[PDB]
Amino acid sequence: DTTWHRPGWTIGELEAAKAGRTISVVLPALNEEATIESVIDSISPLVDGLVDELIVLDSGSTDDTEIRAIASGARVVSREQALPEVPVRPGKGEALWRSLAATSGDIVVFIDSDLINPHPLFVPWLVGPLLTGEGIQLVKSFYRRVTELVARPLLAALRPELGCVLQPLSGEYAASRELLTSLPFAPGYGVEIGLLIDTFDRLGLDAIAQVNLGVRAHRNRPLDELGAMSRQVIATLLSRCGIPDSGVGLTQFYTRHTWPVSLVDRPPMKVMRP
Amino acid sequence: DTTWHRPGWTIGELEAAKAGRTISVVLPALNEEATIESVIDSISPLVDGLVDELIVLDSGSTDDTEIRAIASGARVVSREQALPEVPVRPGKGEALWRSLAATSGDIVVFIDSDLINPHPLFVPWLVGPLLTGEGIQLVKSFYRRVTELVARPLLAALRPELGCVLQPLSGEYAASRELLTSLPFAPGYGVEIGLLIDTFDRLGLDAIAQVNLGVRAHRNRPLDELGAMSRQVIATLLSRCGIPDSGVGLTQFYTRHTWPVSLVDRPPMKVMRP
């Protein structure tokens, strides 16, 4: 009813059904030189078609991410160019929030740049429910772990209504500009879970679609980073639920290292555009 | 000051230093036929010495756990025999709480039965601070993940004072009967984290020791179980922190399976013994 186990639209019908709405695609990138080209290449063909705009939001890459993205014919925007008047904070959430000022589609699609050979229908499938359905403002992807041990158990506990979301933390989703510019953006790795809970709290379970994007292998990143990522997911989720979070970073051990955690959301982007 | 990176006591000094206090060792077991013998064997020699009592608390094993434990010369107590008058609930916490009625040491040591070839000094090292120190009521072990992604990040957020505990969920620890019979016991996999937080909240960081038990490989159990375990750890921790937990179990997917979670602690064992 709100879940597509088998997305089936075609680029043509979807493109027809947009009916005046524009579509922007954002690829957040921080040092993704190895995967960025294939990701861009998989969406390139749609530009000027179903997709009106495609940017790579570079979040301070020091590898060859920008040059490879450019050579793949993508417009690359830095955090600075996106919003020159506000100094740059670290973290993914910052990059995603900033991209809202650097794009202008009525619909905004986010795809992670670390995807190993993404399927060329990711965008069409995500944009599906937004275009054909009605009252849908957010569509999350799922695929066939911070997600399984942290995000989902915590939702069960504090927002049981969302227990039905299979990939709360997924980097692939689409939404309307109206919604996105209305919501605050959580810092760092909190951005996804925060948009999820804010959208639910504000519009109900019915404005949220879920579409199947097939198989995908899990990026086996280091335990230290996962801990830090988990910590921010917790900070963001506790806050959305009205729980005071200590603000104390996760400490690893010898020796002793304390990873950063933030309690500061960016305000709704509407605010920034008087 | 409260942390022993290098436990150094000897069976002899420790045995002298008990000075009238008795020591019970509990091995919780649910289907651990493959490891139970080596675990028992590693502690056996101490019985009648430093250790006065050793039981295996069998939690409904359907494998050869009981017979192997018996053949290793251990007294095996079922959940029923431990407290015949109260029907049995599932879960580890239930087994640990029950063991308090089936033992009588002034000090109680818990060791997990799934340990692959434990070191014979585990008990002496855990009991160390209890015997020689003063004002120490609880000693946790650490070794050189639900722990790293769930328990520790959450403590950072809600009980930052405990961020210094390296293995909040460790199955190897010792404590006084006074403390244990005074504390409620969280259900299932919540028991460790709950004893930790209750002890801290009630006695302060100073009654809690931490001793290094060396290396240990991590039991690579299934993702589904870890999710469920994580959920209960969350339920128990939220409650200790005054947060209402929904009581809704973690659901896995097709198809849809909802794992059990409990919000019901066992009361302090003192209560049961009028």
Coordinates of C-alpha atoms in Angstrom, one line a residue:
Chain A
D1 CA 0.0 0.0 0.0
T2 CA 2.9 2.3 0.7
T3 CA 5.7 -0.2 0.1
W4 CA 7.0 -1.2 -3.4
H5 CA 8.7 -4.5 -3.2
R6 CA 8.8 -4.3 -7.0
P7 CA 9.2 -0.8 -8.5
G8 CA 8.0 -1.0 -12.1
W9 CA 7.6 2.5 -13.5
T10 CA 9.6 3.4 -16.7
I11 CA 11.8 6.5 -17.4
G12 CA 9.2 7.5 -19.9
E13 CA 6.0 7.3 -17.9
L14 CA 7.7 8.9 -14.9
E15 CA 9.1 11.7 -17.0
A16 CA 5.6 12.4 -18.3
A17 CA 4.1 12.3 -14.8
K18 CA 6.4 14.9 -13.4
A19 CA 4.2 17.5 -15.0
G20 CA 6.2 20.7 -14.3
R21 CA 8.0 19.5 -11.2
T22 CA 11.8 19.6 -11.5
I23 CA 14.1 16.9 -10.2
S24 CA 17.5 17.4 -8.6
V25 CA 20.0 14.7 -7.8
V26 CA 22.6 15.2 -5.1
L27 CA 25.7 12.9 -4.6
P28 CA 27.4 13.7 -1.3
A29 CA 31.1 12.8 -1.5
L30 CA 34.0 12.7 0.9
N31 CA 37.0 10.9 -0.6
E32 CA 35.1 8.5 -2.9
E33 CA 37.4 8.5 -5.9
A34 CA 37.0 4.8 -6.4
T35 CA 33.3 4.7 -6.7
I36 CA 32.2 8.2 -7.7
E37 CA 32.5 7.7 -11.5
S38 CA 30.3 4.6 -11.7
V39 CA 27.7 6.3 -9.5
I40 CA 27.6 9.4 -11.7
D41 CA 27.7 7.4 -14.9
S42 CA 24.6 5.4 -13.7
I43 CA 22.6 8.7 -13.5
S44 CA 24.2 10.8 -16.2
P45 CA 21.9 9.5 -19.0
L46 CA 18.8 10.8 -17.2
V47 CA 20.0 14.4 -17.1
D48 CA 17.9 16.7 -19.2
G49 CA 15.4 13.8 -19.2
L50 CA 13.7 12.7 -16.0
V51 CA 16.5 14.4 -14.0
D52 CA 17.0 18.2 -14.5
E53 CA 20.0 18.7 -12.4
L54 CA 22.8 16.6 -10.9
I55 CA 25.5 17.7 -8.5
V56 CA 28.2 16.1 -6.5
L57 CA 28.5 17.9 -3.2
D58 CA 32.1 17.6 -2.3
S59 CA 32.7 17.7 1.4
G60 CA 36.4 18.5 1.5
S61 CA 37.8 15.6 -0.5
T62 CA 41.6 15.3 -0.6
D63 CA 41.7 12.4 -3.0
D64 CA 40.8 12.6 -6.7
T65 CA 37.1 12.7 -6.2
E66 CA 36.5 16.1 -7.7
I67 CA 38.5 15.6 -10.9
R68 CA 37.0 12.2 -11.5
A69 CA 33.5 13.5 -11.0
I70 CA 34.2 16.4 -13.3
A71 CA 35.6 14.0 -16.0
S72 CA 32.3 12.1 -15.7
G73 CA 30.5 15.3 -16.6
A74 CA 29.1 16.2 -13.2
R75 CA 28.8 19.6 -11.7
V76 CA 30.8 19.6 -8.5
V77 CA 29.8 21.9 -5.7
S78 CA 31.9 22.4 -2.5
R79 CA 30.3 23.1 0.9
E80 CA 31.7 26.6 0.5
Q81 CA 30.2 27.4 -2.9
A82 CA 26.8 26.0 -1.8
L83 CA 26.5 28.6 0.9
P84 CA 29.5 30.9 0.9
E85 CA 28.1 33.2 3.7
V86 CA 28.1 30.5 6.4
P87 CA 31.4 28.8 7.6
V88 CA 31.5 25.1 7.0
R89 CA 30.9 22.5 9.7
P90 CA 32.2 18.9 9.4
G91 CA 29.9 16.0 8.8
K92 CA 27.5 14.5 6.3
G93 CA 24.4 16.4 7.6
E94 CA 26.2 19.6 6.8
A95 CA 26.8 18.6 3.2
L96 CA 23.2 17.5 2.7
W97 CA 21.7 20.6 4.2
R98 CA 24.0 22.8 2.1
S99 CA 23.0 21.0 -1.1
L100 CA 19.5 22.4 -0.7
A101 CA 20.9 25.8 -1.4
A102 CA 22.9 24.6 -4.4
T103 CA 19.9 22.9 -6.1
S104 CA 16.5 24.0 -7.2
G105 CA 14.4 20.9 -8.0
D106 CA 10.9 20.5 -6.5
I107 CA 12.1 17.0 -5.8
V108 CA 15.5 16.2 -4.4
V109 CA 17.1 12.8 -4.6
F110 CA 20.1 11.8 -2.4
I111 CA 22.4 8.9 -3.5
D112 CA 25.5 7.9 -1.6
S113 CA 28.8 8.2 -3.6
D114 CA 30.2 5.0 -2.0
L115 CA 27.8 2.7 -3.9
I116 CA 29.5 -0.1 -5.7
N117 CA 28.1 -0.1 -9.2
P118 CA 24.6 1.3 -8.5
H119 CA 21.7 0.3 -10.7
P120 CA 20.5 2.9 -13.3
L121 CA 16.9 2.7 -12.0
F122 CA 17.7 3.8 -8.5
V123 CA 16.6 7.4 -9.2
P124 CA 13.5 6.4 -11.2
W125 CA 12.5 4.0 -8.4
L126 CA 13.0 6.5 -5.6
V127 CA 11.2 9.2 -7.5
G128 CA 8.3 6.8 -8.3
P129 CA 5.9 7.3 -5.4
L130 CA 6.6 11.1 -5.3
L131 CA 5.4 11.4 -8.9
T132 CA 2.6 8.9 -9.3
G133 CA 1.3 8.6 -5.7
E134 CA -0.2 11.4 -3.6
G135 CA 0.5 12.7 -0.1
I136 CA 3.9 11.0 -0.3
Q137 CA 6.7 13.5 0.6
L138 CA 9.5 11.1 1.6
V139 CA 10.6 7.8 0.0
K140 CA 13.2 5.6 1.6
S141 CA 15.0 2.7 0.0
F142 CA 15.7 -0.7 1.3
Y143 CA 18.0 -3.6 0.2
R144 CA 18.1 -7.4 0.3
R145 CA 25.5 -3.2 11.7
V146 CA 24.5 0.2 13.0
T147 CA 21.1 -0.2 11.4
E148 CA 20.2 -3.6 12.8
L149 CA 21.7 -3.1 16.3
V150 CA 21.2 0.6 17.0
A151 CA 18.7 2.4 14.7
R152 CA 16.0 -0.3 14.5
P153 CA 16.1 -1.5 18.1
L154 CA 15.9 2.2 19.2
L155 CA 13.0 3.0 16.9
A156 CA 11.2 -0.1 18.3
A157 CA 11.7 1.4 21.8
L158 CA 10.9 5.1 21.3
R159 CA 9.0 5.3 17.9
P160 CA 7.5 1.8 17.5
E161 CA 5.4 3.1 14.6
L162 CA 8.6 3.3 12.6
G163 CA 9.6 -0.3 13.4
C164 CA 8.4 -1.1 9.9
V165 CA 11.1 0.9 8.2
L166 CA 13.7 -1.6 7.0
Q167 CA 16.6 0.8 6.3
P168 CA 16.1 3.9 8.6
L169 CA 19.8 4.9 7.9
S170 CA 19.8 4.4 4.1
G171 CA 21.7 7.0 2.1
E172 CA 19.3 6.6 -0.9
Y173 CA 16.0 8.4 -0.6
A174 CA 14.0 11.2 -2.2
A175 CA 11.8 13.9 -0.9
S176 CA 10.1 17.2 -1.8
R177 CA 11.9 20.5 -1.4
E178 CA 8.9 21.6 0.7
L179 CA 9.6 19.0 3.3
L180 CA 13.4 19.2 3.2
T181 CA 13.5 23.0 3.5
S182 CA 11.1 22.8 6.4
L183 CA 13.1 20.3 8.5
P184 CA 16.2 20.9 10.6
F185 CA 19.2 18.8 9.6
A186 CA 21.0 16.7 12.2
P187 CA 24.9 16.9 12.2
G188 CA 27.2 14.3 10.8
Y189 CA 25.7 10.7 10.6
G190 CA 22.5 11.8 12.3
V191 CA 21.0 13.4 9.2
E192 CA 19.1 10.3 7.9
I193 CA 17.5 9.2 11.2
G194 CA 16.5 12.8 12.0
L195 CA 14.8 13.4 8.7
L196 CA 13.0 10.1 9.1
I197 CA 11.7 10.9 12.6
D198 CA 10.9 14.6 11.8
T199 CA 9.0 13.6 8.7
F200 CA 7.0 11.0 10.7
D201 CA 6.3 13.3 13.7
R202 CA 5.2 16.0 11.3
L203 CA 3.3 14.3 8.5
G204 CA 2.5 10.8 9.7
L205 CA 3.4 7.3 8.4
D206 CA 1.4 8.0 5.2
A207 CA 3.7 10.6 3.7
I208 CA 6.5 8.0 3.8
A209 CA 7.1 5.5 1.1
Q210 CA 9.5 2.6 1.0
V211 CA 10.9 1.1 -2.3
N212 CA 13.0 -1.9 -2.9
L213 CA 16.4 -1.3 -4.7
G214 CA 17.5 -4.9 -4.7
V215 CA 20.7 -6.3 -3.4
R216 CA 23.7 -4.4 -2.1
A217 CA 26.8 -5.5 -0.2
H218 CA 27.5 -3.7 3.1
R219 CA 30.5 -1.4 3.3
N220 CA 32.7 -3.1 5.9
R221 CA 34.1 0.0 7.6
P222 CA 36.2 0.1 10.8
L223 CA 34.7 -0.6 14.3
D224 CA 35.9 2.8 15.6
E225 CA 34.0 4.8 13.0
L226 CA 30.9 2.7 13.5
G227 CA 31.0 3.5 17.2
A228 CA 31.2 7.2 16.4
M229 CA 28.5 6.9 13.8
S230 CA 26.3 5.0 16.2
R231 CA 26.9 7.7 18.9
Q232 CA 25.6 10.5 16.7
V233 CA 22.7 8.4 15.5
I234 CA 21.9 8.0 19.2
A235 CA 22.3 11.7 20.0
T236 CA 20.0 12.7 17.1
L237 CA 17.4 10.1 17.9
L238 CA 17.3 10.8 21.7
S239 CA 16.8 14.5 20.9
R240 CA 14.0 13.9 18.5
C241 CA 12.3 11.9 21.2
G242 CA 12.7 14.6 23.9
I243 CA 15.5 12.9 25.8
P244 CA 18.4 15.0 27.0
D245 CA 21.6 13.6 25.6
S246 CA 24.8 14.2 27.6
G247 CA 26.7 15.7 24.7
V248 CA 29.7 13.5 25.8
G249 CA 31.5 11.8 22.9
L250 CA 32.1 8.1 22.7
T251 CA 35.6 7.3 24.1
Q252 CA 37.7 4.5 22.6
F253 CA 40.6 2.6 24.2
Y254 CA 45.2 1.9 25.6
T255 CA 45.1 4.6 24.6
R256 CA 42.1 7.0 25.2
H257 CA 40.5 8.8 22.2
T258 CA 37.2 10.7 22.3
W259 CA 35.3 11.0 19.1
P260 CA 33.2 14.2 18.5
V261 CA 29.4 14.3 18.8
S262 CA 27.1 17.2 18.1
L263 CA 23.8 18.3 19.5
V264 CA 23.5 21.2 17.1
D265 CA 21.1 20.8 14.1
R266 CA 21.1 23.2 11.2
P267 CA 17.8 25.1 11.1
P268 CA 15.2 24.5 8.3
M269 CA 16.7 25.9 5.1
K270 CA 13.6 28.1 4.6
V271 CA 15.0 30.3 7.3
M272 CA 18.1 31.0 5.2
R273 CA 16.2 32.3 2.2
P274 CA 14.3 35.5 3.1
Chain B
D1 CA 43.5 3.4 41.2
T2 CA 40.3 1.3 40.6
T3 CA 41.5 -0.5 37.4
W4 CA 43.9 -3.4 37.4
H5 CA 45.6 -3.7 34.0
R6 CA 47.7 -6.4 35.6
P7 CA 46.1 -8.5 38.3
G8 CA 48.9 -10.1 40.3
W9 CA 47.5 -11.7 43.4
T10 CA 48.1 -15.4 44.0
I11 CA 45.7 -18.1 45.0
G12 CA 47.4 -18.3 48.4
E13 CA 47.4 -14.6 49.5
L14 CA 43.8 -14.2 48.2
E15 CA 42.7 -17.3 50.1
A16 CA 44.3 -16.0 53.3
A17 CA 42.7 -12.5 52.7
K18 CA 39.2 -13.8 52.5
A19 CA 39.2 -14.0 56.3
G20 CA 35.9 -15.7 56.9
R21 CA 34.1 -14.6 53.7
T22 CA 32.8 -17.4 51.5
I23 CA 33.1 -17.5 47.7
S24 CA 30.5 -19.0 45.4
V25 CA 31.0 -19.4 41.6
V26 CA 28.1 -19.6 39.2
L27 CA 28.2 -20.8 35.7
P28 CA 25.0 -19.9 33.8
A29 CA 24.5 -22.5 31.0
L30 CA 22.0 -22.8 28.2
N31 CA 23.1 -25.5 25.6
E32 CA 26.9 -25.1 26.1
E33 CA 28.0 -28.7 25.9
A34 CA 31.0 -27.9 23.8
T35 CA 32.6 -25.5 26.2
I36 CA 31.2 -26.2 29.6
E37 CA 33.8 -28.9 30.6
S38 CA 36.8 -26.7 30.0
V39 CA 35.2 -23.9 31.9
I40 CA 34.4 -26.1 34.9
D41 CA 37.8 -27.8 34.7
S42 CA 39.5 -24.3 34.9
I43 CA 37.9 -23.6 38.2
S44 CA 37.5 -27.1 39.8
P45 CA 41.0 -27.0 41.4
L46 CA 40.0 -24.0 43.5
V47 CA 37.0 -25.6 45.1
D48 CA 37.5 -26.2 48.9
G49 CA 40.4 -23.8 48.4
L50 CA 39.8 -20.1 47.5
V51 CA 36.4 -21.1 46.1
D52 CA 33.9 -22.7 48.6
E53 CA 31.1 -23.5 46.1
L54 CA 30.7 -24.0 42.4
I55 CA 27.4 -24.5 40.6
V56 CA 26.3 -24.7 37.0
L57 CA 22.9 -23.0 36.7
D58 CA 21.3 -24.9 33.8
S59 CA 18.7 -22.8 32.1
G60 CA 16.8 -25.6 30.3
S61 CA 19.6 -27.2 28.2
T62 CA 18.4 -29.8 25.7
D63 CA 21.9 -30.8 24.7
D64 CA 24.4 -32.7 26.8
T65 CA 25.3 -29.7 29.0
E66 CA 24.1 -31.2 32.3
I67 CA 25.7 -34.6 31.9
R68 CA 29.1 -33.2 30.8
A69 CA 29.0 -30.7 33.7
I70 CA 28.3 -33.4 36.2
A71 CA 31.1 -35.6 34.7
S72 CA 33.4 -32.7 35.3
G73 CA 32.4 -32.9 39.0
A74 CA 30.2 -29.8 39.1
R75 CA 26.9 -29.4 41.0
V76 CA 24.2 -28.7 38.5
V77 CA 21.2 -26.7 39.6
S78 CA 18.2 -26.1 37.3
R79 CA 16.1 -22.9 37.4
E80 CA 13.4 -24.9 39.1
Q81 CA 15.6 -26.4 41.9
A82 CA 17.0 -23.0 42.6
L83 CA 13.6 -21.5 43.5
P84 CA 10.9 -24.2 43.2
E85 CA 8.1 -22.0 44.5
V86 CA 8.3 -19.5 41.6
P87 CA 7.6 -20.5 38.0
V88 CA 10.5 -20.1 35.6
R89 CA 10.8 -17.2 33.1
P90 CA 13.0 -17.4 30.1
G91 CA 16.2 -15.4 29.8
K92 CA 19.7 -15.1 31.3
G93 CA 18.7 -12.6 34.0
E94 CA 16.3 -15.1 35.3
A95 CA 19.0 -17.7 35.7
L96 CA 21.4 -15.3 37.4
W97 CA 18.8 -14.1 39.8
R98 CA 17.7 -17.6 40.7
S99 CA 21.4 -18.6 41.3
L100 CA 21.4 -16.2 44.3
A101 CA 19.0 -18.6 46.1
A102 CA 21.0 -21.6 45.2
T103 CA 24.3 -20.3 46.5
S104 CA 25.4 -18.9 49.9
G105 CA 28.8 -17.3 49.4
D106 CA 29.4 -13.7 50.7
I107 CA 30.9 -13.2 47.4
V108 CA 29.4 -14.4 44.1
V109 CA 31.4 -14.8 40.9
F110 CA 29.7 -15.2 37.5
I111 CA 31.5 -16.8 34.6
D112 CA 29.9 -17.4 31.2
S113 CA 29.8 -21.1 30.1
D114 CA 30.6 -20.3 26.4
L115 CA 34.1 -19.2 27.2
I116 CA 36.6 -21.0 24.9
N117 CA 39.3 -22.3 27.3
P118 CA 39.2 -19.8 30.1
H119 CA 42.3 -19.0 32.1
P120 CA 42.4 -20.6 35.6
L121 CA 43.1 -17.2 37.2
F122 CA 39.8 -15.6 36.0
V123 CA 38.2 -16.2 39.4
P124 CA 41.2 -15.1 41.5
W125 CA 41.6 -11.9 39.4
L126 CA 37.9 -11.1 39.7
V127 CA 37.8 -11.7 43.4
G128 CA 41.0 -9.7 43.8
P129 CA 39.6 -6.2 44.5
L130 CA 36.7 -7.6 46.6
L131 CA 39.2 -9.2 49.0
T132 CA 42.2 -6.9 49.2
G133 CA 40.6 -3.5 48.4
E134 CA 37.9 -1.8 50.4
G135 CA 34.5 -0.2 49.4
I136 CA 34.6 -2.3 46.3
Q137 CA 31.3 -4.2 45.8
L138 CA 31.4 -5.0 42.1
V139 CA 34.3 -5.9 39.8
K140 CA 33.9 -6.1 36.1
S141 CA 36.3 -7.8 33.6
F142 CA 37.6 -6.5 30.4
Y143 CA 39.5 -8.1 27.5
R144 CA 42.0 -7.2 24.8
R145 CA 29.4 -5.7 18.5
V146 CA 26.5 -4.9 20.9
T147 CA 29.0 -3.6 23.4
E148 CA 30.7 -1.2 21.0
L149 CA 27.8 0.1 19.0
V150 CA 25.0 -0.1 21.6
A151 CA 26.0 -0.3 25.3
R152 CA 29.0 2.1 25.3
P153 CA 27.5 4.7 23.0
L154 CA 24.3 4.7 25.1
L155 CA 26.2 5.0 28.4
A156 CA 28.1 8.0 26.8
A157 CA 24.7 9.6 26.1
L158 CA 22.8 8.8 29.3
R159 CA 25.4 7.9 32.0
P160 CA 28.6 9.5 30.8
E161 CA 30.2 8.7 34.1
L162 CA 30.3 5.1 33.0
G163 CA 31.9 5.8 29.7
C164 CA 35.1 4.5 31.3
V165 CA 33.8 1.0 31.5
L166 CA 35.3 -1.1 28.7
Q167 CA 33.1 -4.1 28.8
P168 CA 29.7 -3.1 30.3
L169 CA 28.1 -6.3 29.0
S170 CA 30.9 -8.7 30.1
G171 CA 29.6 -12.0 31.5
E172 CA 32.6 -12.3 33.9
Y173 CA 32.3 -10.3 37.1
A174 CA 32.1 -10.7 40.8
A175 CA 30.2 -8.9 43.6
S176 CA 29.1 -9.1 47.1
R177 CA 25.9 -10.9 48.1
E178 CA 24.9 -7.8 49.9
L179 CA 24.8 -5.8 46.7
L180 CA 23.4 -8.6 44.5
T181 CA 20.5 -9.4 46.8
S182 CA 19.7 -5.7 47.0
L183 CA 19.4 -5.1 43.3
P184 CA 16.6 -5.9 40.9
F185 CA 17.6 -8.2 38.0
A186 CA 16.8 -7.2 34.5
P187 CA 15.3 -9.9 32.2
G188 CA 17.2 -11.8 29.5
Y189 CA 20.3 -10.1 28.2
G190 CA 19.6 -6.9 30.2
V191 CA 21.0 -8.3 33.4
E192 CA 24.6 -7.1 33.1
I193 CA 23.9 -3.6 32.0
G194 CA 21.3 -3.2 34.7
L195 CA 23.5 -4.4 37.5
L196 CA 26.1 -2.0 36.2
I197 CA 23.8 1.0 36.2
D198 CA 22.1 0.1 39.5
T199 CA 25.4 -0.4 41.3
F200 CA 26.7 2.9 40.0
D201 CA 23.5 4.9 40.7
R202 CA 23.4 3.4 44.2
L203 CA 27.1 3.2 45.4
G204 CA 29.0 5.5 43.0
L205 CA 31.9 4.9 40.6
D206 CA 34.1 3.9 43.6
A207 CA 32.5 0.7 44.5
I208 CA 33.2 -0.6 41.0
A209 CA 36.5 -2.2 40.0
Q210 CA 37.7 -3.3 36.6
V211 CA 40.3 -6.0 36.0
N212 CA 42.0 -7.2 32.9
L213 CA 41.5 -10.8 32.0
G214 CA 43.6 -10.7 28.8
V215 CA 42.6 -11.8 25.4
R216 CA 39.4 -13.4 24.3
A217 CA 37.9 -14.0 20.8
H218 CA 34.4 -12.7 20.3
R219 CA 31.5 -15.2 19.9
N220 CA 30.3 -14.6 16.3
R221 CA 26.6 -15.3 16.9
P222 CA 23.8 -14.5 14.4
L223 CA 22.7 -11.0 13.5
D224 CA 19.1 -11.7 14.5
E225 CA 20.0 -12.7 18.0
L226 CA 22.3 -9.7 18.4
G227 CA 19.4 -7.5 17.4
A228 CA 17.2 -9.0 20.0
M229 CA 20.0 -8.9 22.6
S230 CA 20.5 -5.2 21.7
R231 CA 16.8 -4.5 22.0
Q232 CA 16.7 -5.9 25.6
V233 CA 19.9 -4.0 26.5
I234 CA 18.2 -0.9 25.3
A235 CA 14.9 -1.6 27.2
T236 CA 16.9 -2.2 30.4
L237 CA 19.1 0.8 30.0
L238 CA 16.3 3.3 29.1
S239 CA 14.4 2.1 32.1
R240 CA 17.3 2.6 34.5
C241 CA 17.5 6.1 33.1
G242 CA 13.9 7.0 33.7
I243 CA 12.9 6.8 30.0
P244 CA 9.6 5.1 29.1
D245 CA 10.4 2.2 26.7
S246 CA 7.5 1.2 24.3
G247 CA 7.7 -2.5 25.2
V248 CA 7.5 -3.3 21.5
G249 CA 9.8 -6.1 20.4
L250 CA 12.3 -5.7 17.6
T251 CA 10.7 -7.0 14.3
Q252 CA 12.9 -8.7 11.7
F253 CA 12.1 -9.3 8.0
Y254 CA 10.2 -11.3 4.1
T255 CA 8.9 -12.6 6.3
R256 CA 8.0 -10.7 9.6
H257 CA 9.2 -12.0 13.0
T258 CA 8.9 -10.1 16.3
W259 CA 11.4 -11.0 19.0
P260 CA 10.3 -10.8 22.7
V261 CA 11.4 -8.0 25.0
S262 CA 10.6 -7.6 28.7
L263 CA 10.1 -4.6 30.9
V264 CA 9.8 -6.7 34.0
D265 CA 12.7 -7.0 36.4
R266 CA 12.9 -9.5 39.2
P267 CA 12.8 -7.8 42.5
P268 CA 15.8 -7.7 44.9
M269 CA 16.4 -11.3 46.2
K270 CA 16.2 -10.0 49.8
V271 CA 12.5 -9.7 49.3
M272 CA 12.2 -13.5 48.7
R273 CA 13.8 -14.5 51.9
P274 CA 11.7 -13.4 54.9

